[PDB]
From a paper:
CeuE, an integral part of the CeuBCDE ABC transporter of C. jejuni, is responsible for capturing Fe(III)-siderophore complexes in the periplasm for delivery to their respective inner membrane transporter. C. jejuni does not itself synthesize siderophores, but capitalizes on their secretion by other bacteria, such as E. coli. Here we report a combined solution and structural study of a series of synthetic tetradentate analogues of the enterobactin-derived bis(2, 3-dihydroxybenzoyl-L-Ser), to explore the ligand-binding promiscuity of CeuE, both wild type and with mutations of the Fe(III) binding residues H227 and Y288.
To probe the relative contributions of His227 and Tyr288 to Fe(III)-siderophore binding, site-directed mutagenesis was then used to replace the side chains of the two Fe(III)-coordinating amino acids with non-coordinating side chains of similar size. However while there is clear electron density for the Y288F mutation in its three structures, H227L and H227A are located in a flexible loop region and there is generally no electron density to confirm their presence. Mutants H227L and H227A gave Kd values of 22 ± 10 nM and 35 ± 14 nM, respectively, indicating only slightly weaker binding than for wild type, which indicates that the tyrosinate O-donor binds the Fe(III) cation more strongly than the histidine N-donor. The Λ-configuration signal was observed for mutants H227L and H227A, indicating that these do indeed bind Λ-Fe-5-Lic. The Λ-configuration was observed for all four, but with a decrease in signal amplitude compared to wild type, confirming the reduced binding affinity observed in the fluorescence quenching experiments.
Residue numbers in the entry: 22 to 310
Amino acid sequence: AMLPISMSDEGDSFLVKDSLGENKIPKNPSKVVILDLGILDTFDALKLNDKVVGVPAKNLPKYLQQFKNKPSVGGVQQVDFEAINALKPDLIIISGRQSKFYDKLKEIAPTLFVGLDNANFLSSFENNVLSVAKLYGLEKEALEKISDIKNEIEKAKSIVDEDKKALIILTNSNKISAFGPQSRFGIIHDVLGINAVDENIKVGTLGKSINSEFILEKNPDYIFVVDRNVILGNKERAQGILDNALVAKTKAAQNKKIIYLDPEYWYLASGNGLESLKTMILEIKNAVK
Ligand SMILES: [Br-]
Ligand SMILES: [Br-]
Ligand SMILES: [Br-]
């Protein structure tokens, strides 16, 4: 299990420990740079917009356009260190994608890591949200919203068919990669309890390289697709890679249960957001109800 965030109250500040290191963070930080889209959506849900001074503005998704005019510190992949320094923040918040930049960021300002543990997603989510809330004295409000998520999970789980199985795939222009439980797409299986066609795909971010022959052999009831063609802006789309007589014979094709998930949620991994996680849960529930 990933080490959680822990915090001791030191009067005007908290001494914070997480899986990357230790930081003294001021109470009520007023100049926050946020590189994780999910936690950015949690700042909105907690009414903390005016604490935010820098976001990855370049390809910000549709549900975070209230932050489109914040100073930019980057994009999905790139970080602008010069901009982050000029903003003179009191806190920087990162997740997994930016852990490679930890030491450089920490030279600028205290740097809090809100990692999502693929083996323990809900426990990491709740830890992340409540840790941010503690900084602002907003635990009450954060617990209410976490309860709302919990209730939506239980509603979705209660409609899941015990005997049907799903496959998760990530498409590129000419490539199909499968993902299973305890992946970064794993909440389908791990949180909502939809069964997997293959519970033994090996852990790791590349997933398993597959073809249509594999899809037919597995014969999934549902296929959840995360089309990376969309985030890059290429012409080939998953519907095309899947448009063949092998895929067409599957239960999922026959029952129109090839589900094209919005990659602005699933590929950008906005699970830390109190509203974006709800949107994702509802996206699955409505695909399988
Ligand atoms: Br820390
Ligand atoms: Br505007
Ligand atoms: Br993964």
